[PDB]
Amino acid sequence: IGTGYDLSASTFSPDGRVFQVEYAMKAVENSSTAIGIRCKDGVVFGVEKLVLSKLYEEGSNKRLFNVDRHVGMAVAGLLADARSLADIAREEASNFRSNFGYNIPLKHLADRVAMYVHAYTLYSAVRPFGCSFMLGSYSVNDGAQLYMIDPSGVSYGYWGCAIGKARQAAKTEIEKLQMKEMTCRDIVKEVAKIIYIVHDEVKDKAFELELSWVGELTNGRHEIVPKDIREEAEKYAKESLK
């Protein structure tokens, strides 16, 4: 379906499909799954960061960025475009704080970055970003927020979302949760469980779980999950995986 109308994001297919954006989405669904779940007191991210060669250091090619003092960012797809969008989000938050004098609401940061990525879905001189990403923040006066932005540029709030190869399975297993009533200390455990379930040990041999939450436990600061809590979460996930 294409071969004549899929050469530029500035071209509509006879049935009104911008095929370049769909190919960017195809790119992002061929990447390791990153999940995020929103609970009462924050949002916990999780990444099945594959290790392509063991020559890399633990922590190479992080997919859990930190775009502002209170906003995290999980990414899937092309990592170069993910880092570029992370810098765009960082610049947007910085400009917001400089002009309006307070922290950017995530409902606005998501909109700004989504419009930035939408600007690349219109012109033949540029190409759509090949990365869908999640943003998560918690502030006492606005609560926990979780948003997804895809290559098209659509932003929606999620009580839990998955991006990558195993989006469907991860969402199916997330729905079994009751995240609206749970806390971060348990949501991290369940995020590890979900990542280990959706991972396949036969096609992609090895991966390291990269976790990070932002919430009341961390005073709104988005931090990588402490090493001991990550060890406990992986221990639970492995025991559950039996």
Partner: protein, 248 residues
């Protein structure tokens, strides 16, 4: 985007500019405009192609454009490109007048407009101006002049030339009938009517289908006067009498 680029300003494998050639075909299908250089004047005769009787023809002329105090031009080709070119010609003539406080020599104005056309066939990717013009003028250097211009930016000083539909036949007739340095204004007008008779074969050459303007010098002032309907009718009737007399 290279996919959609028409590559207007590039060379052909055989070394020719297709866009200029296509514009020249367009001009060759356009209205006939011929000019004849006489000893005491120079005239432009132009076939009008829009003859429909619901036209008003408010302006000074429909083909002949006054470029400055001492010069005029005609057009064969696209009318809108003609309008932009004639505006540019007026700007160039007035820029010389401002810079030197004297009228622009005709060849300089032709050269400037032709340089602009060359620019449009050299760089920028824009399509050329599909307009061939036919200049008539006077200056204190070379007297009465007649100039042709091409979309490629070429120009030539002509003593009798025709641009437009049936241009080759008109050029052949002019070559046969033009008398060197011995052609007065009335002789040139008669020759123009005769040439337009064999050029507008289908239209039978009524006086409503031709626009004639003469550039002469009177008391040190150049006068560019579009021939009236009455006197174009007189020219046509005289040519008809001469054609009938040829049978005798």
């Amino acid at each position: 985007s290279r996919r959609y680029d028409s590559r207007t300003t590039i060379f052909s494998p055989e070394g020719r500019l297709y866009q200029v050639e296509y514009a020249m075909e367009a001009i060759g299908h356009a209205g006939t405009c011929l000019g004849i250089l006489a000893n005491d004047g120079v005239l432009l005769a132009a076939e009008r192609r829009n003859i429909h009787k619901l036209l008003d023809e408010v302006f000074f002329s429909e083909k002949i454009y006054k470029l400055n105090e001492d010069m005029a031009c005609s057009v064969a080709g696209i009318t809108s490109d003609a309008n932009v070119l004639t505006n540019e010609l007026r700007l160039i003539a007035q820029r010389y007048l401002l810079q030197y406080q004297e009228p622009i020599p005709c060849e300089q104005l032709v050269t400037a407009l032709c340089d602009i056309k060359q620019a449009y066939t050299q760089f920028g990717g824009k399509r050329p101006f599909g307009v061939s013009l036919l200049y008539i003028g006077w200056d204190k250097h070379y007297g009465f002049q007649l100039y042709q211009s091409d979309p490629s930016g070429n120009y030539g000083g002509w003593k009798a030339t025709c641009i437009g539909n049936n241009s080759a036949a008109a050029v052949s007739m002019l070559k046969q009938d033009y008398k060197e340095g011995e052609m007065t204004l009335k002789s040139a007008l008669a020759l123009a009517i005769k040439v337009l008779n064999k050029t507008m074969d289908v239209s039978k050459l009524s006086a409503e289908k031709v626009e004639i303007a003469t550039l002469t010098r009177e008391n040190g002032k150049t006068v560019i006067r579009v021939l009236k309907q009455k006197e174009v009718e007189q020219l046509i009737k005289k040519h008809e009498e001469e054609e009938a007399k040829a049978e005798r």
